[PDB]
């Protein structure tokens, strides 16, 4: 009676239904959970925002053209201004969170294309200057909601001003590894003849037990167009990719006044 | 070994200690609790901000002169901009909350004075105009953190503009009942020879099971100077009254975008 | 509606409502449509980053051609009134293109959709009165 293509996911007061889905990837075979008492790093009383922040948040819909080359989001910081998870984050020094990334892109049965949806632990990217090394600013490394785009050309700016940003090169995947090897990460491929949604379940992955979300970006969401979009009547059409992310099993420590980072 | 004058109250990550306290008043003999399932009005999933908003919040310290006539705070709206309880409030349509009001005022052993600290259910006050009835604006009825003051003179402004505010008359207690009868409320008296702190424990009191905190103000905190401050060398001294309030056992319903009320 | 005519014989009502939406487009027309319910007491939602924060449902188009957005009973009073009253206001409801609806060639672009209303099994009324349709 049941099928693998119809899936409803509910967290808090938010619901995603999908009728042409592929199967869901639990990353590295572990469902996210709270910090156990045998591994706890801080000793303060942890805040568990039970349903106020364990819910789906819908980002901005980027448009996937025929010349679109890729997108990237840093995952505990693309939700920095989303409801109460953006208010649980900056009022606390520590924070761990599991995730349910759901990437939404659909077309007709006459379109074609592929979207490698990745989820990269410690997605450290390269700077866009050759004056200095490991050299990216804070605003350019943490865009938040809008994310960033990749590029099919590496043009390092000789200015140290405009070179403090990610040299988001698509075939080297930012960090100088080939993109055809990126399938060792937890990944799904949106193929516009088979499916229309990619669902990943991401546990908290870090060397520490719990860490500052304001400093440290745990996961990296990556969407690569493997085969470009090609619609035969209108070759320059645009189908939107909408990313909907939920925090899961969040836990925070060290309450204080609000942290407001710089914007420039 | 133990005494009634030394009391530590801890909620969340906040602590009040006091070494010259009187006994604490649990209002109407009931400790505050969550909404039971046999009385629940909404059917959505309730948000329980377990430790993020059940903690002590310190308001602004008003100065109690020899000519100070009284103060008033509306209790679920004096905390409207306090941490996450001000963020749990405006992102939800429903809200119930117990309270732990702790009023802090201390002097030497040479001062004298009395402070009737009250807690009035449905503290409906009178308007300061005789053009219309039941006629108060929103900003003038809900000051928030700073509260309001009483006055020993009733001057109704003939303008309907400047008359949309509380006619805070002290001996008629705002609502036209005599102030000497206000001891039928849960009350404590700060007496500067006996104690220096007034602690009340206020359950959620409303006809409904749960109600909008943005519309409806449940309790009214009232501090009346019964006997005025009198310090014999300096007759015009000022000792500060600091009010420290904690929400207790909060529960919220109906999540949506943020409510931002008008400011003028 | 049939629900609205019975409620105009009564005064006080409680319970949740059921909005079942029938898509009457073509077969090849695929799409996703957001269906949202926002409880009252804030800005009425106009853009999609205001109605995602409420109680919503993301509906997909295909074989099963009827969704159901439920408006739950989220209310201060036990009984809302059967008038336009400010104190017993109900909620704000919108409907957004989730991604968009895509049609191929040889298929109409402008389509239509039907919208229903009923009552959940916890819906009940009180206080019979006259109505205001007929004179």
């Amino acid at each position: 009676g049941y099928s693998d293509r119809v899936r409803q996911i509910t967290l808090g007061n938010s619901t995603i239904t999908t009728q042409e889905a592929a199967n869901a990837v639990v990353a590295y075979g572990e469902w996210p959970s709270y910090l156990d008492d045998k591994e706890a790093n801080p000793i303060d009383a942890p805040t568990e925002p039970d349903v106020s922040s364990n819910r789906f948040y819908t980002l901005d819909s980027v448009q996937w053209k025929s010349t679109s080359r890729g997108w990237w989001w840093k995952l505990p910081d693309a939700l920095k201004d989303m409801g109460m998870f953006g208010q649980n984050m900056y009022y606390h020094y520590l924070g761990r969170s599991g995730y349910t990334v759901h990437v939404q892109c659909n077309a007709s049965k006459f379109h074609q294309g592929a979207l490698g949806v990745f989820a990269i632990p410690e997605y450290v990217m390269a700077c866009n200057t050759e004056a200095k090394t490991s050299y990216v600013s804070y605003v350019n490394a943490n865009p938040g909601e809008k994310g960033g785009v990749f590029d099919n050309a590496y043009n390092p700016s000789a200015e140290a001003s405009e070179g403090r940003k990610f040299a988001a090169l698509d075939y080297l995947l930012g960090c100088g590894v080939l993109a055809g090897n990126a399938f060792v990460y937890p990944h799904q491929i949106i193929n516009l003849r088979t499916n229309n949604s990619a669902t990943l379940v991401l546990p908290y992955v870090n060397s520490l037990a719990i860490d500052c979300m304001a400093k440290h970006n745990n996961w990296g969401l990556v969407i690569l167009p493997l085969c470009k979009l090609d619609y035969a009547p209108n070759s320059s059409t645009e189908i939107p990719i909408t990313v909907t992310i939920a925090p899961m099993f969040t836990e925070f420590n060290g309450l204080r006044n609000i942290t407001v980072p710089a914007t420039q | 070994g133990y005494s009634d004058r030394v009391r530590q109250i801890t909620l969340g990550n906040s602590t009040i200690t006091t070494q010259e306290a009187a006994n604490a008043v649990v209002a109407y003999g009931e400790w505050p609790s969550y909404l039971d399932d046999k009385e629940a009005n909404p059917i959505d999933a309730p948000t329980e901000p377990d430790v993020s908003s059940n903690r002590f919040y310190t308001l602004d310290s008003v100065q109690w002169k020899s000519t100070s006539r009284g103060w008033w705070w509306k209790l679920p709206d004096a905390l409207k901009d306090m941490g996450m309880f001000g963020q749990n409030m405006y992102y939800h349509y429903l809200g119930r909350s117990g309270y732990t009001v702790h009023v802090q005022c201390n002097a030497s052993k040479f001062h004298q004075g009395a402070l009737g600290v009250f807690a009035i259910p449905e503290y409906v006050m009178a308007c300061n105009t005789e053009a219309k009835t039941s006629y108060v604006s929103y900003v003038n009825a809900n000051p928030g953190e700073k509260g309001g003051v009483f006055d020993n003179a009733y001057n109704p402004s003939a303008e309907a503009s400047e008359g949309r505010k509380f006619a805070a008359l002290d001996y008629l207690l705002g609502c036209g009942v005599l102030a000497g009868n206000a001891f039928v409320y849960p009350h404590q008296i700060i007496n500067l020879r006996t104690n220096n702190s007034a602690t009340l424990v206020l359950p959620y009191v409303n006809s409904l099971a749960i109600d909008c905190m943005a519309k409806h103000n449940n309790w009214g905190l009232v501090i009346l100077p019964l006997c005025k401050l009198d310090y014999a060398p300096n007759s015009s001294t000022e000792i500060p009254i600091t009010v420290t309030i904690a929400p207790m056992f909060t529960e919220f319903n109906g999540l949506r975008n943020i409510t931002v009320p008008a400011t003028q | 509606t049939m629900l609205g005519e019975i409620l105009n014989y009564y005064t006080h009502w409680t319970g949740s409502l059921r909005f079942t939406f029938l898509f009457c487009g073509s077969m090849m027309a695929t799409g996703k449509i957001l269906l949202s319910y926002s409880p009252p007491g804030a800005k009425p939602p106009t853009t999609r980053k205001d109605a995602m924060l409420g109680t919503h449902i993301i509906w997909d188009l295909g074989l099963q051609s009827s969704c159901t957005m439920l408006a739950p009973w989220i209310s201060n009073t036990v009984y809302r009134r059967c008038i336009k009253d400010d104190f017993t206001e109900g909620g704000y409801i919108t409907c957004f293109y989730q991604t968009r609806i895509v049609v191929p060639s040889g298929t109409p672009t402008s389509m239509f959709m039907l919208a229903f209303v009923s009552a959940c099994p916890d819906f009940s009324v009180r206080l019979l009165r006259d109505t205001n349709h007929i004179s």
């Binding site: 049941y2 899936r7 409803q8 996911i9 239904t17 | 399932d37 | 969704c67 159901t68």
Partner: peptide, 26 residues
């Protein structure tokens, strides 16, 4: 009485009650 409301939590499964078909008459 009218029906009560059970304490339920979130789901992620193939059992989908939110989708009906009013062509069937129900």
């Amino acid at each position: 009485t009218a029906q009560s409301t059970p304490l339920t939590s979130g789901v992620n499964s193939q059992e989908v009650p939110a989708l009906t078909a009013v062509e069937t008459g129900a």
